[PDB]
Ligand binder design. Structure first.
Ligand SMILES: Nc1ncnc2c1ncn2[C@@H]1O[C@H](COP(=O)(O)OP(=O)(O)OP(=O)(O)O)[C@@H](O)[C@H]1O
Ligand SMILES: [K+]
Ligand SMILES: [K+]
Ligand SMILES: [K+]
Ligand SMILES: [Mg+2]
Ligand SMILES: [Mg+2]
Ligand SMILES: [Mg+2]
Ligand SMILES: [Mg+2]
Ligand SMILES: [Mg+2]
Ligand SMILES: [Mg+2]
Ligand SMILES: [Mg+2]
Ligand SMILES: [Mg+2]
Ligand SMILES: [Mg+2]
Ligand SMILES: [Mg+2]
Ligand SMILES: [Mg+2]
Ligand SMILES: [Mg+2]
Ligand SMILES: [Mg+2]
Ligand SMILES: [Mg+2]
Ligand SMILES: [Mg+2]
Lengths: 134, 174, 105, 37, 53, 118, 81, 164, 103, 112, 156
RNA sequence: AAUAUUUUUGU
RNA sequence: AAAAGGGAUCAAGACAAGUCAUCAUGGCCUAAAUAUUGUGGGCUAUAGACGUGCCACAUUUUCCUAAACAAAGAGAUGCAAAAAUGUGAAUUUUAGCUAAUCUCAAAAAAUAGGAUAAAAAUAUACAAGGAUUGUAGUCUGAAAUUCGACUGCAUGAAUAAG
């Protein structure tokens, strides 16, 4: 974040989440003896301020490429915009069509792909299979 | 048929009606063991209005205690039975209130005041001082000790013919 | 000698005089209730848990002004931090230590 | 008064008069609805 | 101090704007079944499937 | 005094006296006193003789006696004649609301009868 | 269906009204939760009790109860012999 | 693995500055503040919600009454304390569809507030959905200033005479 | 408050009887047994009035009956003082000194 | 029986009731929208009395496997249905033995 | 208690308002100015915090009369969406004076503490340091709390 | 120092 | 600050201790049945008797009124604000939040007042208590009859501290 010019604030230690389970040590009648288990989730918070929207994405892109094993990440990105979002999102079609000129090579399919059928229904039910139910 | 063990089944004069209620509502205004405060001055017809007495304790007249007791001015929650002679501190608010009552009755005016405040800060006893300045100056005092006895439905009530009002005969008699 | 515990007075916050005396005990043992104004801000716990907590707070803050009072606050009991804490419940027990009924037969 | 109670609760539609009872119950009923009686 | 009939005019302006059901009488329209999100696919993917052995 | 042929003592609240009948509870009694402007804390010795007569004539137009027990006893007899599961349990003096019968069925055996106490 | 606002529980039954004078056999059913509607007040039922089919003659008094309320599943507990 | 990261922090990180851009404060037209949540390579059902929050006073096309009518139509979406209309949308399968909805929905809230048919001026602003918080502060009369030191030295001397 | 306490040794007084031997008790144990006697009498009295001062005025009336020597707890005090006086010789009984000495 | 796939598709601990509960989860996945419509028509008091009585009779003819209340989580290592932890899909015992060995990520013996 | 709906019931089983009671309807009029006392006098009504219901109409009027006297252009107003008010209570408390009683001054506390000591009920040296202590434990001089900490204590 | 109630059975 | 406290851990061996009904496994058995599928029923039966629990038998209790103080945990298999409706269970409709942000959510005892007493045994003053049952409803769910959890009205058992 320093090289990208983003002023970061943290790491802020958030309250650790503790899930507890008490199971019997035996698989049978012996219930007068049980033991406690837990799963503590240690977390941190790095908040960035006064950062360019695009430069914030290069930062999040850099952390995902070189992510450390055993860590989860969730980022909330904020951005200001003008009124009339419908017009803006349509005018920005040609701009995104150029940046994708060299990236369309990733996908390839036989002419008139028939296995997809209803395009919108495919993504909906395929996104569930990828996420396992939801 | 059942065969378990079952316990086998196996003193003083009771109090009169109203005896118990009269025990938690009795007011004790003296204590023989307490010492007689030397220098304790009694009140005068114009003693609760002087501002020079602010911060001094003065005893209630012997005859006013019978009038304050006739209309239940005192209350059990108040600690009167710890001393010998019932006395009240002349508060700064007593002079302000009593100075307005003295000017109201003087020129036939009327003051309509609501004494509001926090808890035991002493609203109730401020009326006792107002009623005290009334008796000593030959006023007509009409006091309702508890306003919850008129609304909690604990006394007889009857309607009036051709009107939305309701009378309380048993209370108006007492 | 004004004291405001969480914005309210000492009487409007603690309805029990035993707690009022214990909150400002530090200023009472040293006979300085009439020379310092306290503005406390408590959070968590109960009545006694908060009353005694203010005792160690005013004591420590009082020492910042007059550090020579520690020998007195020592004997008054306003310098020690009571570490007593509710014991956790343990499996096989009804409470921290209460055990269920034991049947010999 | 069980009949009157039924009419007030579930209306006179199911009540026998002179009409969901006529066709819905017997209509959905078919042969071999449940093997083994 | 605001008439109820005059309040429903504002409650109705929100329904036309946010596209919500306007039911001032509380009629049982069975809409609680429509808002409930399906949980079928979440339960079906409980037992893992046969994979490479 | 007297109310519907039942005698009550002076030192007895009217609220509690009207509740001594089969069928009258907190709702009915509360509305019968308001109808004649009797504060809940009224005792029998304070009721005038004319208002006592109004209460008697007031309860005579309600189901405040065996007329009520009849409805309850008729509902139990109908369950027995129809041959329902709930009817047998009344006759057999057994719990009628699906309760474990391995233990603690004393109050059922004592009160469950085709002719209830009320 | 307990809540009254959504009608009673109805199950498909072969309650076909015969012509006057015809012989109709009783209806053998295992739907012990079928509300006794007024439409078949007078028909002969044979409700399943788990092992046997107990005869039943629906009358105007049973309208509202379930069919399983007239065929006990367990046998009365009797001590001794 | 530490060396792999130290090799990246010494040779690859400095190259991030060649493609960085400076932050510019939003102009007067930037009235909306959208939020997009990412899970960094994970598929989570909550990564489709888009939260937007704007200030009624930022819309300089509405009058005083048209701005207040906008607060009444917002309903529980308006925060009287912060004066911010916050509203999210997760009705659609894609974030792009949830942003377009809030973009069109805000144009209806403004177009409806500009409707002179009913101004709802008789309806007082309802804020029962919000729970206002009371914050206490240190009394400014207790600050030991040069003037309070003199007020205390007097009160401390007046107490010595009453006893003496 | 009693000045002594009776502690018995199981089955040393004869055929299964305990050998009650007096022993002194400190102040705290003296004031505890005393006040607990006063409460045993207060809990057996009948109710008299109403209000919050019900239980407080019953205990206060027993403290007056104590100082005035017209209470029942005095008889409970002399009843335990006589046991010590009667059993004052058991301190040197032939049982507490010959428990298991002679094999 | 008609819902039991002719080719086993389970990779976990297979059982008589494990295969029986997996066949119920797939039958309900295909009939949830259709079953949610009957439940919506039965509660809509605005529809005709006949439409609600029809939708009420069709919901009774649905196969038991289609009912969602039949689904009961089971252990993917032992096939049991009693004492199953949703967060792990195993009995309380299997969770213990795997938690101590370190097979369940993040779990830890609690002591405090 | 008289600024709410009484607990009484009319023949139609409807709660009677406290102001409809003949006895309460008299004091209310003398307090509102309707019934004019020709010979003058005073009409004082003291609230209570022990066993007292809450009436927003009374607690609001008290806040309006105190704010007006304090010279403030802005005065507390009703809650436009609350249904806990009563128009009758507002008209009665429209032109009444409010006397707010707070803790006694430090000089009045002493005069009351010296009276308790002279009676033997307070065995303490009553000086400025001792009057400022009871003035704190009693919430800035609450007379009722000052008695709980010096008379109804378990130290004497 | 000279104290002493009774207390069976186990394929 | 301090004389600190608690949790986990707690050996070998014996009890041929418990588990071939988690799993796993040797021998021995069933293989048109000791395997497999569905509907309904049962596991909820009840003479006597035994275990743990809840609650009550009023005076340090319960009841009524009010402007105090917690911690921890839960919500992608969902926790549900506000409002409106109903005496109530609850319904209608979804704001926000997938969370130190939003929501469940409100602590209660307590503190301070107030009500009721021949507060059960002298029957015209039968206390507290809430089991049993009748009836009208609501919620989940194909489905509440055997056999669910709550709500209103009525009914009003034993129970003197064992
Ligand atoms: N002016 C006074 N002089 C002497 N004693 C006083 C005075 N004011 C109050 N007290 C004492 O303080 C205690 C509380 O007084 P009081 O009962 O009048 O308070 P209150 O404001 O009426 O309380 P509440 O609002 O709860 O009804 C009493 O014991 C009283 O004797
Ligand atoms: K969509
Ligand atoms: K061992
Ligand atoms: K009773
Ligand atoms: Mg008062
Ligand atoms: Mg505890
Ligand atoms: Mg038992
Ligand atoms: Mg109390
Ligand atoms: Mg042998
Ligand atoms: Mg063995
Ligand atoms: Mg065995
Ligand atoms: Mg096996
Ligand atoms: Mg069982
Ligand atoms: Mg109770
Ligand atoms: Mg709500
Ligand atoms: Mg909860
Ligand atoms: Mg008694
Ligand atoms: Mg049932
Ligand atoms: Mg016992």
């Amino acid at each position: 974040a320093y090289y990208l010019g983003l002023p970061a604030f943290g790491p802020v230690p958030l309250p650790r989440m503790i899930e507890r389970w008490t199971v019997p040590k035996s698989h049978f009648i012996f219930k007068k003896s049980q033991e406690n288990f837990e799963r503590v989730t240690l977390r941190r918070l790095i908040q960035i301020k006064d950062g360019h929207p695009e430069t914030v994405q290069l930062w999040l892109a850099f952390l995902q490429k070189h992510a450390y094993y055993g860590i989860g990440m969730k980022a909330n990105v904020w951005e200001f915009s003008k009124l009339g979002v419908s017009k803006a999102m349509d005018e920005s079609k040609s701009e995104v069509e150029k940046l994708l000129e060299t990236r369309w090579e990733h996908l390839s399919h036989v002419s008139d792909m028939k296995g997809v059928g209803n395009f919108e229904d495919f993504l909906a039910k395929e996104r569930l299979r990828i996420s396992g139910g939801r | 048929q059942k065969l378990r063990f079952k316990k086998t089944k196996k003193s003083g004069k009771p109090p009169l009606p109203g005896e118990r209620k009269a025990y938690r509502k009795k007011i004790v205004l003296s204590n023989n063991n307490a010492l007689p405060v030397p220098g304790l001055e009694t009140l005068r017809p114009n003693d609760l209005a002087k501002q020079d007495n602010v911060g001094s304790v003065k005893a209630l007249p012997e005859d006013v205690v019978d009038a304050l007791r006739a209309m239940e001015a005192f209350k059990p929650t108040q600690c009167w039975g710890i001393f010998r002679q019932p006395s009240v501190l002349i508060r700064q608010e007593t002079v302000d209130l009593t100075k307005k009552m003295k000017a109201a009755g003087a020129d036939g005016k009327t003051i309509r005041m609501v004494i509001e405040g926090n808890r035991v800060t002493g609203k109730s006893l401020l009326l006792l001082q107002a009623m005290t300045h009334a008796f000593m100056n030959d006023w007509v005092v009409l006091h309702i000790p508890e306003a919850q006895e008129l609304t909690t439905a604990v006394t007889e009530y009857a309607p009036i013919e051709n009107s939305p009002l309701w009378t309380q005969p048993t209370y108006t008699l007492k | 000698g004004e004291v405001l515990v969480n914005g309210k007075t000492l009487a409007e916050y603690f309805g029990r005089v035993h707690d009022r005396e214990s909150a400002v005990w530090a200023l009472r043992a040293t006979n300085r209730i009439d020379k310092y104004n306290v503005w406390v801000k408590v959070e968590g716990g109960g009545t006694t848990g908060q009353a005694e907590a203010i005792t160690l707070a005013i004591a420590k803050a009082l020492l910042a002004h007059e550090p020579a009072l520690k020998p007195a606050l020592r004997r008054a009991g306003c310098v020690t931090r009571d570490p007593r804490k509710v014991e956790r419940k343990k499996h096989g027990h009804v409470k921290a230590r209460k055990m269920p009924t034991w049947v010999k037969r | 008064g069980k009949l009157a109670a039924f009419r007030e609760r579930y209306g006179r539609g199911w009540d026998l008069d002179a009409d969901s009872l006529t066709d819905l119950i017997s209509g959905y009923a078919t042969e071999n609805m449940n093997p083994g009686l | 101090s605001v008439p109820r009939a005059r309040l429903l005019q504002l409650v109705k302006a929100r329904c036309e704007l946010f596209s919500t059901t306007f039911n001032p009488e509380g009629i049982r329209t069975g809409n609680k079944i429509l808002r409930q999100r399906l949980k079928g696919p979440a339960l079906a993917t409980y037992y893992p499937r046969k994979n490479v052995g | 005094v007297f109310i519907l042929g039942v005698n009550f003592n002076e030192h007895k609240l009217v609220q509690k006296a009207l509740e001594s009948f089969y069928g009258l509870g907190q709702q009915a009694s509360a509305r019968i006193l308001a109808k004649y402007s009797i504060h809940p804390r009224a005792k029998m010795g304070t009721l005038p003789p004319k208002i006592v007569t109004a209460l008697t004539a007031e309860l005579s137009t309600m189901t405040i006696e065996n007329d009520a027990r009849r409805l309850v006893l008729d509902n139990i007899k109908r369950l027995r004649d129809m041959g329902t599961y709930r009817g047998r349990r009344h006759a057999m003096g057994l719990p009628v609301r699906g309760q474990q019968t391995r233990n603690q069925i004393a109050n059922a055996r004592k009160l469950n009868k085709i002719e209830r106490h009320g | 269906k307990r809540s009254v606002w959504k009608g009673p529980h109805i199950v498909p039954l072969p309650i076909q009204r015969p012509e006057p004078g015809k012989k109709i056999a009783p209806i053998r059913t295992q739907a012990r939760s079928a509300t006794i509607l007024p439409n078949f007040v007078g028909l002969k039922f044979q409700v399943h009790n788990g092992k046997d089919y107990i005869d039943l003659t629906v009358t105007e008094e049973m309208v509202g109860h379930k069919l399983g309320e007239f065929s006990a599943t367990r046998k009365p507990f009797i001590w001794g012999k | 693995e530490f060396r792999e990261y130290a090799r990246i922090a010494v040779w690859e990180m400095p190259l991030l500055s060649k493609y960085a851009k400076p932050f510019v404060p939003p102009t007067s037209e930037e009235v909306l503040r959208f939020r997009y949540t990412t899970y960094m390579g994970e598929f989570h059902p909550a990564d489709r919600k888009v939260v937007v929050e704007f200030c009624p006073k930022d819309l300089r096309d509405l009058s005083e009454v048209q701005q207040r009518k906008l607060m009444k139509l917002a309903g529980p979406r308006y925060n009287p304390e912060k004066d911010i209309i916050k509203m999210s949308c997760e009705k659609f399968e894609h974030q792009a569809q949830n942003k377009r909805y809030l973009g069109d929905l805000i144009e209806k809230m403004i177009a409806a507030a500009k409707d002179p048919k009913d101004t709802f001026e008789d309806i007082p602003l309802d804020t029962r959905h919000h729970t206002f918080t009371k914050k206490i502060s240190f009394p400014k009369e207790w600050l030991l200033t040069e003037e309070r030191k003199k007020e205390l030295e007097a009160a401390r001397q007046q107490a010595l005479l009453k006893d003496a | 408050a009693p000045l002594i306490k009776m502690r018995g040794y199981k089955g040393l007084a004869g055929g299964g009887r305990s050998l009650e031997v007096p022993q002194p008790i400190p102040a705290r144990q003296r004031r505890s047994t005393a006040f607990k006697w006063i409460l045993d009498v207060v809990n057996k009295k009948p109710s008299k009035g109403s209000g919050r001062t019900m239980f407080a005025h019953r205990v206060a009336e027993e403290i007056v009956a104590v100082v005035e020597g017209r209470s029942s707890v005095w008889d409970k005090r002399m009843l335990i003082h006589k046991l010590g006086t009667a059993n004052r010789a058991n301190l040197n009984s032939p049982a507490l000194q010959l428990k298991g000495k002679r094999f | 029986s008609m819902f039991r796939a002719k080719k086993l598709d389970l990779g976990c601990f297979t059982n008589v009731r494990v295969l029986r509960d997996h066949s119920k989860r797939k039958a309900f996945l295909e009939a949830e929208p259709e079953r949610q419509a009957l439940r919506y028509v039965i509660r809509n008091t605005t529809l005709p009395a006949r439409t609600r009585a029809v939708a009420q009779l069709q919901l009774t003819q649905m196969h038991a496997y289609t009912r969602p209340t039949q689904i009961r989580n089971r252990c993917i290592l032992g096939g049991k249905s009693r004492g199953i932890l949703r967060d792990f899909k195993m009995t309380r015992y299997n969770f213990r033995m795997n938690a101590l060995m370190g097979n369940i990520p993040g779990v830890k013996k609690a002591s405090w | 208690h008289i600024m709410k709906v009484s607990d009484y019931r009319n023949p139609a089983f409807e709660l009677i308002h406290s102001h409809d009671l003949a006895l309460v309807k008299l004091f209310t009029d003398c307090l509102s100015g309707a019934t004019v006392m020709p010979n003058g006098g005073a009409v004082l009504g003291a609230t209570t915090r022990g066993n007292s219901p809450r009436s927003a109409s009374m607690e609001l009027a008290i806040a309006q009369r105190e704010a007006e006297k304090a010279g403030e252009k802005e005065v507390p107003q009703r809650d436009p969406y609350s249904k806990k008010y009563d128009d009758r209570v507002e008209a009665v408390m429209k032109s009444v004076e409010i006397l707010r009683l707070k803790g006694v001054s430090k000089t009045e506390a002493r005069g009351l503490l010296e009276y308790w000591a002279a009676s033997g009920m307070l065995k303490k040296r009553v000086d400025e340091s001792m009057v400022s202590e009871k003035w704190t434990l009693s919430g800035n001089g609450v007379v009722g709390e000052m008695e709980r900490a010096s008379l109804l204590t378990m130290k004497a």
